[PDB]
């Protein structure tokens, strides 16, 4: 937006193995889950009509926002993405009731998340 960025030259944003890994491996596969479809759209607040979302939920994020910072090389490595990825899941659990479809989906979505994360390069290699 006009203020907070998704890409910035002065701000470090190198390409490491972990970074490129989670981008194409983790979130892109999370994306391919047919239950991850309600997370295909970022919280624009207006588009999805979520005005009080920005009041209750701390960091209104999803999967399109995470991948946006990833493809724009916002961080240095995927370790920084572990923050936004973590919030996207909790956000759904908090705003939505545990009996909601989106919650039921998020629970299953989380499986492939940790699945690919456990297989992450535990050493890291800057490209």
């Amino acid at each position: 937006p006009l203020g907070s960025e998704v890409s910035n030259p002065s701000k470090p944003g190198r390409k490491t193995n972990q970074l490129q890994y989670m981008q194409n491996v983790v979130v892109k596969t999370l994306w391919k889950h047919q239950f991850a479809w309600p997370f295909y759209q970022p919280v624009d607040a207006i588009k999805l009509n979520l005005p009080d979302y920005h009041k209750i939920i701390k960091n209104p994020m999803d999967m399109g926002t995470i991948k946006k910072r990833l493809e724009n090389n916002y961080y240095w490595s995927a370790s920084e993405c572990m923050q936004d990825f973590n919030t996207m899941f909790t956000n759904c659990y908090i705003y939505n009731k545990p009996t909601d479809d989106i919650v039921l989906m998020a629970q299953a979505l989380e499986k492939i998340f940790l699945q690919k994360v456990a297989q992450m390069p535990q050493e890291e290699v800057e490209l």
Partner: peptide, 6 residues
């Protein structure tokens, strides 16, 4: 929307 997207 938010509320059972089935």
């Amino acid at each position: 929307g938010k509320g059972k997207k089935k």
